[PDB]
Structure 1
Amino acid sequence: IESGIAHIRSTFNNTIVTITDTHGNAISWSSAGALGFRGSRKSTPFAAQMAAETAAKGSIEHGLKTLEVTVKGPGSGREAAIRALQAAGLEVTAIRDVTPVPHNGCRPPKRRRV
């Protein structure tokens, strides 16, 4: 294929990037822990850059070239992963900043120091 959508989910531990096909069929996937970083280094935006690089390498086989990147999850590695999809040979056209916002929904687990 030529076109797909890049789902980045960056949460406070991990930044998982799956480059999928438009009606949701994953070409290749790699996480920050898949690259090898096990500790807190999973949270650094360099691992998100590396994960976007590995997902870009995996996506260009049977292939695809022009992405459409959907940012999900509250984290840090969104900007480096969008930039690293560009520098790894792909094009990033649209940027959907879609973290799942509940309106009121379920109640969160308790705050931590209490």
Structure 2
Amino acid sequence: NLETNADIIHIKLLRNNTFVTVTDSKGNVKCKATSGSLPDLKGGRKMTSYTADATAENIGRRVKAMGLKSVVVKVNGFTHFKKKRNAIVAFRSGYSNSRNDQNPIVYIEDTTRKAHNGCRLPRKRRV
């Protein structure tokens, strides 16, 4: 009683916007959310942890509403691990209201890669 094709939740956590995308096992996008596209956040600032875990909350509720039961979380970003852990538990919060319902997450992965001295990064900011 083992099934193969679980859905994928990609969570790219950049510096100024977090993207959460819900795909199938072949990469086809079913729904997506960004920091700037949330109904309540009105401009100003976007890099704080509140935008990240609010986007994770939103995608968790939207994924519960479409009746999915088996997801695989892939996390990407050049940040500390505390923010990725908080985003994952916020997605679980979005799926399950009181952290009582069963976990749809069956796998967690970090897919963050570094350039092997590739292109030259831009100049410093003398602020």
Residue type at the aligned position of 1:102: A
* Per-residue Cα deviation, 1:92-111 (whole angstroms, up to 9, x for no partner): 23222222311121111122
Note the 1:5-16 alignment, pairs <5 A: 5-16=8-19
> Any stretches of 5+ residues in structure 2 without a counterpart?
96-102
Q: What's the counterpart of residue 106 of structure 1?
A: 119
**Residue 8 of structure 1 aligns to a residue in which SS?**
strand
> Any stretches of 5+ residues in structure 1 without a counterpart?
none
Residue type at the aligned position of 1:46: Y
**Please, what is the CA RMSD of the aligned residues?**
2.2
Q: Which moved more, 1:47-56 or 1:85-94?
A: 85-94
Instruction: Report deviation, 1:113.
Output: 2.3
- 2:28 pairs, out of 25, 32, 36, with 25
> TM-score of the superposition, structure 2-length normalised?
0.74
Work out which of the two has the higher radius of gyration on C-alpha atoms and give 1 or 2.
2
* Per-residue Cα deviation, 1:29-74 (whole angstroms, up to 9, x for no partner): 111111143221x212222111112112223344422221111122
- Bigger strand fraction: 1
- Identity, in percent, stands at 37
Instruction: Report deviation, 1:26.
Output: 1.3
Q: 1:49 to 1:26 in 2, by over 3 A?
A: same
Contact 1:82 1:92 in 2 (8 A): no
Q: What's the counterpart of residue 96 of structure 1?
A: 109
Contact 2:22 2:31 in 1 (8 A): yes
Is 1:39 paired with 2:44?
yes
Query: Whose RCO is larger (CA < 8 A, sep 6+)?
Result: 1
Contact 2:60 2:92 in 1 (8 A): no
